[PDB]
Amino acid sequence: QWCQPGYAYNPVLGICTITLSRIEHPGNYDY
């Protein structure tokens, strides 16, 4: 299941969903 940036495959829903990292995680995507 290919997922787009800021999203992550969701084997519980059937598609990709926004990851919590997108919310507030400067360290995750500090760049």
Cα 5 from Cα 3, distance rounded (Å): 7
Structural domain of 6: 1-31
Q: What are the b/e assignments for 1-31, b being 16+ CB within 10 Å?
A: eeeeeeeeeeeeeeeeeebeeeeeeeeeeee
If you ran DSSP here, which 8-state letter would residue 24 be given?
A: S
Structural domain total, the chain: 1
Place of tokens 């992550």: 8
Q: Which residue has the tokens 């760049």?
A: 31
Residue 1 C-alpha from the chain's centroid: 13
CA nearest to 29, candidates 4, 10, 12, 6 = 6
Which technique was used to obtain these atomic coordinates?
NMR
Integer Cα distance of 2 and 6 in angstroms: 12
Structure tokens at 25: 């995680």
Q: Which of 18, 14, 23 is nearest to 4 (CA)?
A: 18
